[PDB]
Amino acid sequence: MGPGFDFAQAIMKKNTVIARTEKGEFTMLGVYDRVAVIPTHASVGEIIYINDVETRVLDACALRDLTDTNLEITIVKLDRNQKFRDIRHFLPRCEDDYNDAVLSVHTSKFPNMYIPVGQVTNYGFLNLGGTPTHRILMYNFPTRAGQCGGVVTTTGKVIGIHVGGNGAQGFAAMLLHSYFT
């Protein structure tokens, strides 16, 4: 509808796949080469389905901060025959608050879904499903099951991936440039 949705659509059309684990179907953001991200609660194993094709996982790292606190981001290297467009230059360098963000989801249940979530707070600490979690972004939208892995963007930045909600607010894990050097 406008330039927020334009940037979101550009990311979805080239930099997302549908990932399936034993824990469900997730939006998965490809960042560069064969490297992608997914919520840690997807429980990535040795094999994952990528657009319904059996794919070997070459490496998987569940990120934690230097206090040994969950960040809810798993970085996955896929045994895929094709690279992602390199979008690392759209990643923020530091923790921040944002205006006018879009959450974009693409799964079998929710194809071509875009949600204007509005203002995004650097929330910080969240007890996410019982697990202490840091670097959480919050937006005041009633996000639902099937949105995990959804990409959070502003115009010109890819800022996070959706990891949960409480019925009234949604929560994303930050993406930072330093995760992907």
SS (H, E, C) the chain: CCHHHHHHHHHHHHHEEEEEECCEEEEEEEEEECEEEEEHHHCCCCEEEECCEEEEEEEEEEEECCCCCEEEEEEEEECCCCCECCCHHHCCCCCCCEEEEEEEECCCCCCCEEEEEEEEEEEEEEEECCEEEEEEEEECCCCCCCCCCCEEEECCEEEEEEEEECCCCEEEEECCHHHHC
Q: How far apart are CA 179 and CA 62, in angstroms?
A: 11
User: Tokens at residue 146, please?
Assistant: 């099937």
User: Resolution of the experimental model in angstroms, please?
Assistant: 1.2
Q: How far apart are CA 176 and CA 169, in angstroms?
A: 22
- Listed in sequence order, the residues at least 6 apart from 99 whose beta carbon sits closer than 8 Å to its beta carbon are 118, 119, 120, 154
> Within 10 Å of residue 147's Cβ, how many Cβ atoms?
23
Q: How many residues does the chain have?
A: 181
Q: What is the residue type of 51? A: N
| Residues acting as catalytic residues | 41, 72, 148
Q: What is the residue type of 44? A: V
CB 170 within 8 A of CB 164: yes
